[PDB]
Structure 1
């Protein structure tokens, strides 16, 4: 039962994951406070289906 959907900032199904390879720096898609992390807005089907591009790096 992997892959999660969020309806917070908008309300749809923010695609993401929790498994080991769950998004990048960010906790997973969605917004952390300001347009930063992928948010699941990194066009799915790209890369390798892992994470959504990440952003809140360090």
Structure 2
């Protein structure tokens, strides 16, 4: 009928453990990274950044 477990010396320890699990359930459907396609990258959209021109005659 005790609501606490004693130690090897006689020290009381509140360990009713009435409930099975004792933890805060994390929220589901968390915000996952957005990336449905490869075009998502701003770099892919940006024009050629190589500037490989050939000025001359």
TM-score bracket for the superposition, by shorter chain length: under 0.3
Higher strand share: 2
By relative contact order (CA 8 Å, sep 6+), the higher-ranking structure is 1
Change (3 A) 1:32 1:4: farther
TM superposition score normalised by structure 2? 0.22
Mind listing any 5+ residue stretches in structure 1 that lack a counterpart? none
- Matched residue pairs, number? 57
Runs of 4+ in 1 over 2 A off after TM superposition: 20-58
What RMSD over aligned residues (CA atoms) do the two structures have, in Å? 27.8
After TM superposition, the structure 1 stretch with the greater mean CA deviation from structure 2, 26-35 or 39-48, is: 39-48
TM-score (norm 1): 0.22
The one-character-per-residue Cα deviations of 1:11-50 (angstroms, maximum 9, x if unpaired) are: 1211112312367999999999999999999999999999
Unpaired stretches in structure 2, ≥5 consecutive residues: none
